Each structure stands twice: as C-alpha cells, then as structure tokens.
Amino acid sequence: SAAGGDLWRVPSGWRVGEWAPATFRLHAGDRTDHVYITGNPERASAAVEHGDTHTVSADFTPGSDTFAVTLDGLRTDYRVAVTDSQIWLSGGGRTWSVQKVREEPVRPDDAHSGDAELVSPMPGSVVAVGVPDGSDVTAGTVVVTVEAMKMEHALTAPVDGVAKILVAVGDQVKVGQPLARITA
Amino acid sequence: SVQKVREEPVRPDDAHSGDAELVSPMPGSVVAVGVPDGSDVTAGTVVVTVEAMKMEHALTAPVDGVAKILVAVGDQVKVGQPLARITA
Amino acid sequence: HRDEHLALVAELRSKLAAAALGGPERARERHVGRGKLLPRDRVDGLLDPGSPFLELAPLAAGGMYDDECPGAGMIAGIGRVSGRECVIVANDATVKGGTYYPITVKKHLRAQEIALQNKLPCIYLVDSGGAFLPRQDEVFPDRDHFGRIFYNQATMSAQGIAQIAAVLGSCTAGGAYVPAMSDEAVIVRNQGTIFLGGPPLVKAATGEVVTAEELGGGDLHSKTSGVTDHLAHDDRDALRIVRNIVATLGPAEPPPWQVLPAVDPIADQTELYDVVPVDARVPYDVHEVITRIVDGGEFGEFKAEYGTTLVTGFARIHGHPVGIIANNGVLFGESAVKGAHFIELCDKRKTPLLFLQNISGFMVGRDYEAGGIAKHGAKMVTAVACARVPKLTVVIGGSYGAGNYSMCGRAYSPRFLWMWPNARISVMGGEQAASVLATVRGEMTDAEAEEFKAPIREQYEHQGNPYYSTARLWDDGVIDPADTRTVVGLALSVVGQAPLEPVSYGVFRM
Amino acid sequence: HRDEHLALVAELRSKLAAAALGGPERARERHVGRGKLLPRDRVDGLLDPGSPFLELAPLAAGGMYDDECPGAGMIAGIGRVSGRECVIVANDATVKGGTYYPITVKKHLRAQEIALQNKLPCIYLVDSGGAFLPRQDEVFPDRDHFGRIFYNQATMSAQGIAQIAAVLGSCTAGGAYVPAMSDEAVIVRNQGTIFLGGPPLVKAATGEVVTAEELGGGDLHSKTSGVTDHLAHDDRDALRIVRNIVATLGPAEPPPWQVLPAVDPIADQTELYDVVPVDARVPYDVHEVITRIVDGGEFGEFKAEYGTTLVTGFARIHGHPVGIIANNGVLFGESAVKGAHFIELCDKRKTPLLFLQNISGFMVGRDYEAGGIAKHGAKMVTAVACARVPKLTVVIGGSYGAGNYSMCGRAYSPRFLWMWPNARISVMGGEQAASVLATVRGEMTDAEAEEFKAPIREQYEHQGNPYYSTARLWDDGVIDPADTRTVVGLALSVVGQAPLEPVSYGVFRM
Amino acid sequence: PPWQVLPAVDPIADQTELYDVVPVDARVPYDVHEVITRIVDGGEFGEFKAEYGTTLVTGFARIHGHPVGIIANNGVLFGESAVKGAHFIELCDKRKTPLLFLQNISGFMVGRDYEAGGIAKHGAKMVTAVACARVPKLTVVIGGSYGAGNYSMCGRAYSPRFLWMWPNARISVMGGEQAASVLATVRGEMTDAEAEEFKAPIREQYEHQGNPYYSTARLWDDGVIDPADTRTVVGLALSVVGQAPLEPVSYGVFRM
C-alpha cells in the first residue's frame, strides 16, 4: 500500500524469469522461520519454513487498527499494532507478538572469534603489567601499560578469558607489537 | 443519478459517414474476392485479399452495408487503389 | 495465435530457469560448503525487500562455448538498493570460477554503459578467476576489452556516479583494479583475496610459496595495505555494508518530464498473444498492440491519416509520458518524414521515445528512389541519432537492414533494447535473401531452387534467432510479450534519472 | 641490434607494398578500363600537392579472410585537403567490389572516431557492394556494427564536423545512407549509383527489370530526387568539387598549448635500431630512445632519482610540448605514484602525453601486495583514464596485462596507438604463460616440459604478433621505428585541433 | 540544502555523558568513538577504513538529520592516517556531505623511518584535500590543536565555516610540554631543580597563550562552548551552511 503503485517500490519481486518471493524472517515465541509470499495482496500464496503452503488474501487499510487475513479461506480480523521492531496481533481468540529478525550469517564463527590480541598503539616501553601471565581476566581489566611520548597507554582486555602476557616491564616495543593475547 | 455528457457536434454527420472505401495497402495483385459483388456484408468480413511483397493483405469490411467489388482476381493494383466500397 | 506464443514463452522461461541455476550442481555444493552465498542469492540479498530486478541479458553466451558458461558467468541488472536503483554486476563464481569469457567482458561493459547513461550507482560483487586464456585475444587488448572496465570506473567516478565493490572471493591480475578503482571497497575476511600477481606467478617468478590468504588476504588489505575500506565477517555482512554505503549517496534526480498517476491498461496483457502473429509474413494492425500496453488505452495518434505504415503518437505508460513509434508495414518516404517530424516534437516536449520494431525495410522501385526515399529515410535516421530524449526499443517482429537503423536499433544507443521471442534480426530477412540470391542465380527447377534456398534460409534463421541475438548482447534480453508493459514501465523510471542535453541536430537533408 | 630491426622493417615495408596494390591485377584492369581512378589514386588526387598522408591501419585484416581482403578493402587516413587535415575514408572497389567485411566496418568506425575526437572533416569516397553476407552477423546489428556509421555521421554533423561524400561507384542498401546522411554529397555522372534496394531486389519483389543507372543513377539523384548536391563529370571532377567544398569550412582551431619552432633531433633516427633490442628479454635504458626522438635532445626528467623503472619528463617534438612516460623495467608502486603525479602536472599544464610502452607488468610478491602496489597502480590508471590532454601511445616493446592499462593501452582511448615491428601484446607474455602453467602442472622432465610449453608459446607468439594486432585494429598501424618521430609529429598537430575539457578525476585511492 | 536532510533522530545518550568520557588532561588517552557515538543521531556511525590508520577516525553519520562526514583525531597522525583522511574527504566532496573535524592532535609521528616513508607527502595530501574541499567544513577543538596537526585538521587558516573550542582545549604552535622538552634538550644536561626552573617560564607562556579564552578573545575561534552543547551547535550550524550552493569539485596537485 505504501508503494502507491510505483513499480520500483511495489514489493512484487518481479523478474524476467520466475519471480522472487517476498521473504520475511520472523520470530514469535520459540519459533523463528521464513515466510515466503508470492502474488499480490488480493490473491497470494504463503509458504512457511518447516511449515505448509497456504492461500492468502490480505485486506490492509492505511491507518486502520484492524487488518484482515483470509488464510486458506478462513477470514480472521486482527487488531494490529506495530513498533519499529515488533508486530502485535490479536484475533481468533489469541494474542501474540512477532519480531522481524536478521538472517543468520552463512558462515558460523570459529572459536577464534572469542579470542583477541592487544597490540601497542605507539612505539614506547612497557611501564607496568597489571595481570599475571596466563590468568583469567574480565573485559574490564588493564593488562599492559605502554608509555610513549609521555602518555600512558593503558590497554584493557576486550574480552573475558585467559590472558597471556608477552612482555616484561622495561621492554621496548614497536607499533603493532603483540603485548598480550586473551583467549576464550 | 446525473451523467455529465459530451457536447453535441455542431454539424450532423453526412449520410456518407457510415460508408467505407477499402484501398490496397500495397502494390500487388488481387488473389481472392471474399464476397459476391453487391451483397450485404457485416463488419470483419474479408472482402478482398491483395498479395504484395510475398505477403497476403486480407482487407475486412469495417462496417455493415452493400459491398461493391471493384477488381477481379489477377488484377494488378497500385497503392491506395480502391478495391471495394461498403455503402451503409 | 495464442498457442504459438505460449510455446515460445514456455521455451523462454525454461531457458531462463536453466541459466538461473549457474554452474554444475557440484560447483554449487562446493560454493555453499565454503559458507558462501550463491551469486544469485548475493544479488537477491542486496536488494530492498521484494524489489523488482531487471536482469541484463540473462541468456548471454547461450549456445556459445559449448554452453559451458551459463549467463556468461555473470549476473547483471538493475535493482533497488537502499531506495535507489543501482546497477549490480556479480561474478558467478560457480560458472568456471567466474572466468571472464569474451561475452563476460561485453556484459560487464554493457552494465557499466547502462550505469553511465542513466547515472545509476554501480555495485560490483567480485569473485573471478581472471581471463579465459585460450581466447585472451578476445578478452584483451582492444578498446572494448577487459581494460575498458576500469576506464569506465574512473570516468564514472569523475562524474560522481558512485563505484562500490565488495570482494567476496578471488580477484586477480587486472581484476585487482575492480576493487582498487572503486570509490569504496568491501572485502570478506578469510574469503576475499586481491593481488596483481597470484601464488602461481609469485612461485614462477621468485620461487617463494605463498597462500592466497598470505599474499592478499582481507586482513592484509584492510589493516596493512589499505587497498580495502571495510572488513566484512561474511557475505551477508558485506551486503549489509554495501547497503549502508549506498544509503550515503543521497537521492536520484527527478525526471525531466511530468509523471502522472499510473492508470491501468484496458486489457489483460496476455491478450497480446491473440493479436500478434508469430509468423512475420502475416500482417496485423499494430494499434492492437499499442492500445493494450498504454495507460487507459489512451493514444493520441499524430498524422493518423498520413504515412499510415508508421504509427506515431503520445501515450502514457505507468504515468510516464511516451512517444510511441511503431511499424505497421513497409516504410515509405511519407512514413520517414512523419517519423522525423514526430521525433522533433518529442525532443522539444522532452518526451521519451518508444520504438516498436517490425520492419522489413523500405519500399523498392524506380519511382520510390526517384521520389527521394533515401533522403527521407536519412531525415528519420538523423532525428533518431540526434534525439536527446531517452529512447527505448522493443523488437516485436522483424528487424531487417536499413529499417533497423531508422527504428533505433542497437547502433543508435537506445537506453535499452529487448526482443520478443518471435523476433528476427538480420541484414535482410531470410526469405528475402533466398529470393534475391535465387534471382541472381537465375532459372532453376522447383526442386533445384528449393535445394539452393535451404542453406540460405538455414543461415538467416540460425543467425537471426533471438537467442542467437541475446547470447551476443545485441539486445538486453528476450522478454515475454505480456511483460512488455512492465519492462518499459521499469525502464521509464530508470531513464528519467539522467538530465537531458540540449536539442541539437545534424544537417537534415531537406 | 641493427640487422634484426632492418629485417623486421624490410618485412613491414614488403607487407605495406603488397597491401597498397589492393585487389588482383584483373580487378585493377577492369577498374581502370571503365575510366575510373584507382582508389589509392583517388585518395592521392584528393590531397594538396605533396601532402603527407597518415594512413590508418594499412594492414587491417592481414592474415584474415584467407588474405582475400587486402587492407580490409578500405583506404583510411589523415591528409591535408585545401589547407586542412581531413579524415579520408575510401572504399577500395578493387577488393571484393568494396564489400564491407567485419574489419571494414571496424576500420570505418575507427576513422570516424579519429574524426570526432580531433574535430577533423570527414570525406567519404563511396564505392561499395554492401555487406559480406556470410558474416552478416558480424557486420550487422550490434552497437559497433555498420549502422553505427550513420549514427556517427549524424552526431558529428550535429557538432559541425563537416561530413562530405563523393559517390564514385555503387552505393547500396544501408550504404545509401553514407551520401544521404552527408551534409554535402557529390556523385559522378554515369557510374555513381545510389539506392536503398537494387535491381536484384526490385526484380525479386516486383518483377520489374531495371539497370542500376535507371534505378538511382547520378542524373536521377542530381536532377530529380535531390539525394545529391553536385554532379561530377568524372572522378577528377568529383575530387575537385570535394576540394572546393572543404575550402568553405574555414580554418582549424589553434592548439591549446604553445608551439615553438621545431628543433632538429641530435641523431639520425635509424640509430634507434642500434639501441633497442628486438629480444624483449634484453634490458636497455629507454633514455637512449627518448634523447634521440626529442627536439635538440633536451629532456627535463621529473623525479629522475625516484621510481626509476618509469621515466617521465618534458620535451618537445617538432616544437609541440610533450610529457613522455616510458617504461624502463618492471613497474613498482613508486613508479605508479610517480606516473600519476606527472600526469596531474601535464593535465594542469595542458601538455599532451606520449606513452612509450615496454611493460612486463607489476612487481610480484607478498611485500609488494602488502605495500599496496595495486592501490598505486589504480592511482596511475585513474590519472590515465581521466586525463583531459591528448594521449598518444607507441608500443616499442612488450605490452602485457595490467601494465597495458597503466600505460594507456587501447581501452584508455589514446588519440592514436602504434606498434613497432618488434612489439608484443597479450594478457601476459608467452614465457610467463608457459612458466606459470608449467608450475601449475608441476614437476616434469625437461623434454616433457618443452613439449608442454611449446603450444603455449606458439599461441602467445601467434596472437601477440603485431601483424595479428594491426589486422584487428587493436592499433592504428605498425610503423618503422625510425619513423616514430615523424608519426608523433604529425599526430601532435592533429590532436591540438580539439579543445580541452576541464580537469576532472575520479576518486584517487590514496 | 544541497544534500538530503532526513528526520532527526535523538542521540542514544545524555550529552553530559561527554563529561565522563573525555579527560580534561590532554596527556590521558581515550577512544574518540566515545564522543562520536554520543553526538550522532541514534548512535549510528558508519566508519570508513576502521582497521587502517586507526589514529584517525573517519565515517558517516547524521546530526539532527543532516549527513556529516566526521573526521576525528584518535592519537598521533601517521602517514596512513593522512592518506585515509584525504580519501575520505574525496568521498565526502563527491557525495556533497559536509565535514565535521573533531581536533585533538599533538602532531605527526616523528623519526627517521617516518620521514623516509614520506609522512610529509601524505600530510600534504590531506592538507590539499582539506583546503580544496568544496563542501562546508565545521571544526570543534575538543582537545589539543598543535602545529601541522592544526593545519591537517582544518584549523582557522582553512576557512572552516565555523570553528569552536571546548573549554579544555589548547592551541599553539607546540604543546607546552613539547616546547619545554625541546628547549631543555637544546640546553643539554642540567640539574632537575635547574631544569624545572628553566621549563617554568616556557610552560607559563604556552599555557597563557594556548588557553581557550586567550583564543576566543582574539577571534581565533567563534566561541568557547559547553561540551554538552556541541550537538546543538553543530546542528544549528548544519542548517546554516546548507544555505549556500556548492562550487564544483577542484583539487590542487596531490603529491602522490
């Protein structure tokens, strides 16, 4: 409705070949799934991930508090309210909210994503070590302090983990020199 | 209900307004005549077919009336030559 | 005529579905197994939700290269990203590792030509193994070979047409300039690799052994070399970053012309299957096409009673004004004079031109040459070549010889050109060629004449076929006839985004 | 190195002499026996007395089409007519009746591109039997196929670049637009003929029998149709009339830079044979070339101590200022940064650029990619593509891969590009290709290694050869090295005749 | 305005949180992202080259719906930081996006390997980009503003459309401790009680002349502002500077 018939704004998914389903990833309760909708609000089909394929018709009125869905021929009239992030629906004797959620990353993290490395921001010398080598620390913990140009660069552990310290007080250090590694 | 209607034309159309003259779209030759000369015809009836440039131009009567045929099969025809005339 | 059109559109849609898959299934499995999005899912994931996507030449290189290179190994087209229409060019890494074949270069250059002419931001999703070395002389060195891609990036960047790259896989040799020449480059960590010379060359030249991650991995370029501007965790994070970049470009220009509210056409567009013969030898009235594609069926014909083998008039399509020029028979001198006058009107009124080609050629004979049909044709060609308004061309039937030139064929730079599946394009029609060559060889028996004509008909049918045309990028796609209104409607919104030049004509041979 | 250059130049001059004859001697005899001038005598008869003539691609289509199409059936080049440099395009009616082969189209379009870029009047001496129908799909319909000739005529005419035709023989089908699209057209009485459809088509379509003089002879067009503007008694009268037309165009624009009196070079230019190795594997100092081609030997080198594998500096050639950019080894990042800065200086000083290519490529290895050599190369490519001054390129040695792009190869639209006879051009050098592919194939016996490498070497030697290049219009000609100074000196006077655009660059990847 | 203005979005933080995250003592390092994410609309900040030249932070945001390219010091300037800044300014110039400079700059990295690396040439490229940029420029001095770092970050000589100081800022050809240390190094060896007596007048000079009220008294800036008003002041200024049309893009020769 908001597209106002402007072809580039209408969510038709038009293609020269097979049209692309309008795709929503939705979270409600303990269920997160895609809904794929093809067609137009007057006559559409919707398929749900881990679910079935249903006929859909959707009767949206701008600024209305009510919205109607005919699902496999069963018309239900919902009270609807929407925030930046949640859709609240009530109808058919039940009430719920649904969140639109981001896609999962196609590549999951390696456990290295829990690890971090501290590097000297400046050339200078290590003036204090705040943590014993190979010890558990929290992301609030100052691990190594470098002095350069009369500035104390106190470097804070970015993660909770086992901190291993690579330098001793009085060591000269270069830019980007690893001073500690902190591991999950 | 009230309808807003378009203004009436200031001249009535002359009796010829229902008549049509069918002219050859191309130079070529007549390959069929579809209706007997002087018959009644109805719109969309094929009246004359001209072959030109190795294509067949079948010309329909656009209106019902007496169809008069002005050419015979095998006649060569120029562009815009009247092949038939339909009289309301 | 409906069943013949349905059979042709079924063949079209089958070919489109086959090309859309990309490479062999084992290549798709190896691509996804490394945690990548498939190239078409990369494109779809870049678009705004439910955006249309006007794919450029999906059947490029079809029937070429033993069909080993579906879509020429590339996905290209226009889609809405962050509220702007952008040209997206994505290497299909599943087709031969994204190797550039000669048609892959041609398709990339055509996508950049569309972006330059319409002022569209360019997004390059880069994942290519380099040039197809057995045909390197067709991939390199000429003016419209691979080196021209970067010439296009630089000069478009000079005009402020944003050039954005995301490096999603390999990027080697001259291809390393696709990221490095872009205004803003994204690279995926532990996937994207950029180098002017890769591990095999480093080994052959220096004896050093390196992996493609040590030589030019994403960490190296994002932290140390500065060749890249954003480090993405994965393909989805890269597409998200590209969307955020495009959100900084600001809006497109408003059209030069006034756009009204779109009015629905008076007919279901599959009625076009009823009115257009597949056999080009069967005449029909092209008004039956026009009144079905235009808004509300409203069509104001110019010079309706004069030069009647050419139909010219003003309409709207999706609220955009359009001047339609459509063939309705052989071109006469009167028809070309009519067309030139109409184009001058459209130029002054700033109205886009739509050319519906179904042209056998000009009228032949001594009285027509004496009448100066050649100079009336030249006046129409001058008007077409010099017209400053956007031109769109749909080839709905024949497109032969000098009639192709008068009707704004590919040489005249229409912003887009598409073929219907029944179209044919050739220096002359196949039956005309067979007839003229038979007349030159002289008297023959009917069987001797048929045996002489059959090879000529076969040549012109094979070369003039619309899939032969589209495989070579002579057009931007074969389209379903019933989609014509939508394709033009999408294009009319694109072509309004460039400002008009002033009116300027060559000398009309008066 | 002298004897190797002498052997290569002797081969060049033998090929040029063979191509200059045009068609077979029986065809030349039939041409002259009808009282015509030979096409090359038509061109020579058009020029001012003793004018030089800078022929475009005289060995086009060499080794193609079974060598049945010498010069691609066309003579094209720049000569002085009535005190102005004009682009002359003449159909060689002795070669296959002047049929347009695909390279004939490409050569015609290149001549029009030279005329557009340098604002040169175009003279078309028309005498052509039409398209080569067996390859009509390479002659028609694409953007750079035969229809583009008329688009060029129209748009050049819109810019006031005079388009002049003389119809000296047949002119058929779409070729009828060459005269009809001209601003002013001459036709020779009783042999020039113009028609959109010839006697064979008139017979096949209508059964009427006509001669080519009855249908569209010179009397008909000059008295009745008005397709032509002057009736010439013979070829020499036609050339006289064309000279009178050109005398009405007024003068060329003065150069945008200051031209000083030319100072002689300090050496005989055949000394270039002594200093340049034919074998591209042999290093030499390119200053030995530069100091020999420039006026007085004066060369002001810029950043002489930095990036020393690229030589950049200011000189004069025939009094015109030039910024010379010349390869002197492998390109480093420092070299590309140097080149980009020098190009910015030339752009602001309005000084035309001369590129002397002998480039293997960029320096390879992990420390160079980490140093961002691709980013520095991209800065040089941006400067080359965006430079507003005229660019000239001479390929004096290798021209391989991305080094071709950094050095203003054909994709970057240098106003002219020429090859020396020892040059090579390919996506990589033949030895590099053979080495990299052998390294990928792995360990093999030397007798097996040579058997594997020989086909690769043969491919890159065959495709990279400068006659293979020039046959396809990848360059504007192979030139004798000792002619380099003259060729550049002539071109510098041509390229000054167009006004400069304003300075504008794409985003430099700093 | 020549750019697109969107509906303004509130910042994610109370602006007096700026008092927590910025040290008054310029010798104490802090991450300038703590400032940026508090002043921009919705906290949204698209950083450009986040992993490279990390002592300069550059990125796109909105302030009161106006687009801004923020350029902020985050340490000493390196050559990498200056080429980053120049590239980002070229992007903002083509995108017609106004530039906001947040100065806290001691200067460029010193030493033989940096001069050999051409740090002066990279600084010159950033200075060229700043001087030639055709978009409006706004400058807030949030900390130190010393020497050639002032010039590289669009100080008063570069005609920022407005320039303001925070009350903790300092501005002089050197910092006071740099001047005192360099002059004591030229004095050579001296007793600590003699070194402090030598340094005290130099510190006093650079503290007196570098103070923000000494600056504003002489119109070297358009005002000392409360840090918590920075978002409002820039927002007001962003509505002003959109009222002039842009000149075309044009740069001097970049010393590549």
Ligand SMILES: *C(=O)CCCC[C@@H]1SC[C@@H]2NC(=O)N[C@@H]21
């Ligand atoms: C039989 O094929 C004769 C040709 C018929 C088609 C025509 S004639 C007129 C048009 N001009 C041309 O060159 N071909 C077209």
Ligand SMILES: *C(=O)CCCC[C@@H]1SC[C@@H]2NC(=O)N[C@@H]21
């Ligand atoms: C032997 O041929 C090893 C290959 C040498 C190729 C050289 S290396 C450096 C340049 N870069 C390139 O691509 N070719 C050149």
Ligand SMILES: *C(=O)CCCC[C@@H]1SC[C@@H]2NC(=O)N[C@@H]21
């Ligand atoms: C201590 O008093 C000396 C401080 C000044 C030197 C440092 S070096 C790096 C910064 N750049 C500059 O000019 N001064 C700062």
